[PDB]
Structures are given as structure tokens and as C-alpha cells.
Amino acid sequence: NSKLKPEVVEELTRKTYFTEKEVQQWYKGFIKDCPSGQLDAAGFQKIYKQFFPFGDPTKFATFVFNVFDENKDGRIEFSEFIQALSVTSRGTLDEKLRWAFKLYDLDNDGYITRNEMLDIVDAIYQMVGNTPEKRVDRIFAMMDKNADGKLTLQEFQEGSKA
Amino acid sequence: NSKLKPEVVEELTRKTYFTEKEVQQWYKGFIKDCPSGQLDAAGFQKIYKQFFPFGDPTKFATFVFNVFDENKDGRIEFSEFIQALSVTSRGTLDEKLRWAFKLYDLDNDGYITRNEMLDIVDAIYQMVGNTPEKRVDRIFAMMDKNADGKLTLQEFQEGSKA
Numbered sequence: 001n002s003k004l005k006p007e008v009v010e011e012l013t014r015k016t017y018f019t020e021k022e023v024q025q026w027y028k029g030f031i032k033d034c035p036s037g038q039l040d041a042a043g044f045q046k047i048y049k050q051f052f053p054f055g056d057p058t059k060f061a062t063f064v065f066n067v068f069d070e071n072k073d074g075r076i077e078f079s080e081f082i083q084a085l086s087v088t089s090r091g092t093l094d095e096k097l098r099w100a101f102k103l104y105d106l107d108n109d110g111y112i113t114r115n116e117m118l119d120i121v122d123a124i125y126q127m128v129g130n131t132p133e134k135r136v137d138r139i140f141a142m143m144d145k146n147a148d149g150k151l152t153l154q155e156f157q158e159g160s161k162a
Numbered sequence: 163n164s165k166l167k168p169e170v171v172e173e174l175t176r177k178t179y180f181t182e183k184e185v186q187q188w189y190k191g192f193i194k195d196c197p198s199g200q201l202d203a204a205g206f207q208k209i210y211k212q213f214f215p216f217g218d219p220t221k222f223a224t225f226v227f228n229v230f231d232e233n234k235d236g237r238i239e240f241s242e243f244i245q246a247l248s249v250t251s252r253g254t255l256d257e258k259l260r261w262a263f264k265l266y267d268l269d270n271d272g273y274i275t276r277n278e279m280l281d282i283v284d285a286i287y288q289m290v291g292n293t294p295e296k297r298v299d300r301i302f303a304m305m306d307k308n309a310d311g312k313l314t315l316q317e318f319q320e321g322s323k324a
């Protein structure tokens with residue numbers, strides 16, 4: 001697919017923070033980087049592995065892939081790609097924190113657990129190539145205001161602002 | 163330039179850790195991402211700005227650009243691009259630390275100063291989007307074994323191994 005139909009471009013423009021022109025430019029890049037119009041987890045993994053040669057980005061890349069892959073069907077289509085870039089780059093602080101929460105909520109149950117947060121920190125450290133546990137412990141002491149071992153989105157947002 | 167001449171591919175293959183086939187594959191990607199065959203600082207900046215929407219990667223991207231741009235002429239040619247990826251991805255630990263030293267040595271005088279290191283840490287924090295100063299202070303206490311306020315490559319390597 002070389003170019004998007006104007007009905008699709010319009011739809012994506014109303015649904016994102018991008019202009020009609022930016023949507024078509026983003027699509028040109030997407031297809032050049034993904035000739036099939038869809039990126040599977042292997043290809044997302046390859047991308048990250050090439051950008052971070054000093055470490056092992058496999059774990060963090062998987063976490064990011066799962067946020068891009070909204071419908072969880074194992075592939076990132078252009079609609080999912082451009083929506084993620086729209087929110088992460090031009091969304092409200094509320095929308096951006098909501099996106100980060102999704103990244104951190106690894107099993108998608110609406111709660112971030114201590115284990116989930118430690119997996120994020122561990123993954124970032126591996127990708128790079130005070131420790132993880134003490135980090136998580138402090139974060140949860142400062143955000144888990146009901147001390148139930150889980151962070152809701154409000155807890156994550158309230159603390160992240162603080 | 164669609165494809166490289168076999169004399170050039172051979173040269174790059176002997177000069178890098180890549181195979182003849184990998185050199186040509188890397189060139190296909192480079193040209194698709196850089197149609198003119200050369201990336202200036204503006205374009206490198208754009209790339210990083212698109213990958214890190216939550217922060218400001220301008221400062222760190224500049225530091226990385228200067229390492230890629232070995233001859234310091236303001237553009238990254240394919241030969242410089244593939245050499246950087248060769249060292250960062252397949253070099254000895256010694257070669258990889260030497261590359262990191264170049265990144266950190268912002269003015270290229272063969273020494274990393276406290277200010278240079280704080281600029282690196284500050285840039286990484288901005289890109290992301292214990293503090294920087296305390297970090298630098300500890301690193302220099304553990305690596306500046308002659309306490310002259312500068313890190314030579316041997317100091318950086320010895321400590322980085324430690």
C-alpha cells in the first residue's frame with residue numbers, strides 16, 4: 001500500500017493530534033520501514049536491537065510493543081502506530097501518563113504491582129547495558145497511598161505529578 | 163545512490179565486523195532513511211526527536227552525532243555510520259569502551275572532565291523526560307585515581323571494568 005485513501009486519512013486526522021499532511025508523511029515512513037504495512041513482535045524487536053547495541057533491549061521492547069498493539073493481535077498496524085505517536089508526542093499530560101501506565105501495567109488489569117514495576121526497571125537497565133528493587137520500593141512507598149501493593153492510575157498520576 | 167560498488171563493499175567489509183551481505187543490507191536501510199546518502203545534524207536531531215516524544219533529546223543527540231561524525235565535517239556518511247554500528251555492536255569490550263569515551267569526551271581532547279560528564283548525565287535525563295551532580299561526583303571519586311579532575315581513557319576503562 002503506497003498511499004492512504006482520503007477517507008482513511010481524514011479518519012486518522014480527526015482521531016489524532018496530527019494534520020492530514022502529517023498523517024500521510026508518517027505513513028510514508030511507516031511503509032518504508034515496514035513494507036508489509038504491519039510490524040510483528042520480531043520486527044519491533046529487530047528495530048530496538050539495532051538502536052541499542054550496548055545492551056539487551058528484548059524485554060523492554062516487548063513491553064513497548066504491547067502498548068502499541070492495542071487490540072493485542074500480535075501486530076502493529078498503522079492506525080495503532082500513529083495513535084501511539086499522537087498520544088506520546090502531543091497529548092495532554094493526563095493522556096501521556098495514561099499511556100505510561102499502560103506500558104507499566106504489563107498484564108493489563110488496571111493495576112501496577114511491585115513485580116510489574118521491577119520488571120520495567122530491570123528491562124530498562126538491561127537495555128541500557130540505588131538499585132532496581134530499592135527504586136521500586138521507594139516509588140511504591142510514595143504512590144501506594146492505600147498500601148494495597150497495587151498502583152491504580154490515580155495513584156500513578158497523583159504521585160507522578162507531586 | 164541505489165547500491166554500492168563491490169570495491170567499496172569489500173573495503174567496508176574488511177574494515178568492519180560485518181559481512182559483505184550485511185554491509186549491503188545496512189546500506190539499503192541507510193539510503194531509505196537518508197535518501198541523499200548523508201545525514202546532517204538537523205536530520206539526526208529529527209530522528210531522535212521522533213523516537214523520544216516524552217523528553218527533549220536535542221542535547222544527547224548532538225553528543226551522539228559528534229561521535230558518528232568522525233571527521234567532524236557536519237555530516238554522517240555511510241562509512242561513518244557503518245563503522246559506528248560495527249564497533250558499538252560487535253567490537254571488543256575495549257573497543258566499545260573507547261567509543262563510549264569518545265561520546266563522553268565532548269571537546270575531543272582525550273580527557274573527560276567533571277563538567278563534560280555532568281552534561282552527559284543532564285542530557286540523558288532531559289531525553290528521558292541520587293541526582294546528576296552526585297552521580298558525577300561519585301563516578302569521579304571512583305575513577306579519577308590521580309585526582310586531577312580529568313579522566314583519561316585508562317581511568318575510564320579501569321573503573322568501568324572494576
Ligand SMILES: N#Cc1ccc2[nH]cc(CCCCN3CCN(c4ccc5oc(C(N)=O)cc5c4)CC3)c2c1
Pocket residue numbers: 050051052053054191195226246247250258259262265
Ligand atoms: N561499552 C560501553 C558504554 C559505556 C558507557 C556508556 N554511556 C552511554 C553509552 C551508550 C550511548 C549510546 C550509543 N548508541 C547511540 C545511538 N546509536 C545508533 C544511532 C543510529 C542508529 O541507526 C540505526 C539503524 N538501525 O538505522 C541503529 C543506530 C544506532 C549508536 C549507539 C555507553 C556505552
Ligand SMILES: N#Cc1ccc2[nH]cc(CCCCN3CCN(c4ccc5oc(C(N)=O)cc5c4)CC3)c2c1
Pocket residue numbers: 029033064084085088096097100103212213214215216
Ligand atoms: N508521561 C510519561 C511517562 C511516565 C513514565 C514513563 N516511563 C517510561 C516512559 C517512556 C517509555 C517509552 C515510550 N516510547 C516508546 C517508543 N516509542 C516509539 C516507538 C517506535 C517509533 O517509531 C518512530 C518512527 N519515527 O518511526 C517513532 C517511535 C516512537 C514510543 C515512546 C514514561 C513516560
Ligand SMILES: [Ca+2]
Pocket residue numbers: 068069070071072073074075076077080
Ligand atoms: Ca494490533
Ligand SMILES: [Ca+2]
Pocket residue numbers: 105106107108109110111112113116
Ligand atoms: Ca497489572
Ligand SMILES: [Ca+2]
Pocket residue numbers: 144145146147148149150151152155
Ligand atoms: Ca494502591
Ligand SMILES: [Ca+2]
Pocket residue numbers: 230231232233234235236237238239242
Ligand atoms: Ca563526517
Ligand SMILES: [Ca+2]
Pocket residue numbers: 267268269270271272273274275278
Ligand atoms: Ca574533554
Ligand SMILES: [Ca+2]
Pocket residue numbers: 306307308309310311312313314317
Ligand atoms: Ca585523572
Ligand code: NA
Pocket residue numbers: 012013014015016017018019
Ligand atoms: Na488532528
Ligand code: NA
Pocket residue numbers: 067101102103104105106107108
Ligand atoms: Na498494559
Ligand code: NA
Pocket residue numbers: 174175176177178179180181
Ligand atoms: Na568484516
Ligand code: NA
Pocket residue numbers: 229263264265266267268269270
Ligand atoms: Na569525543
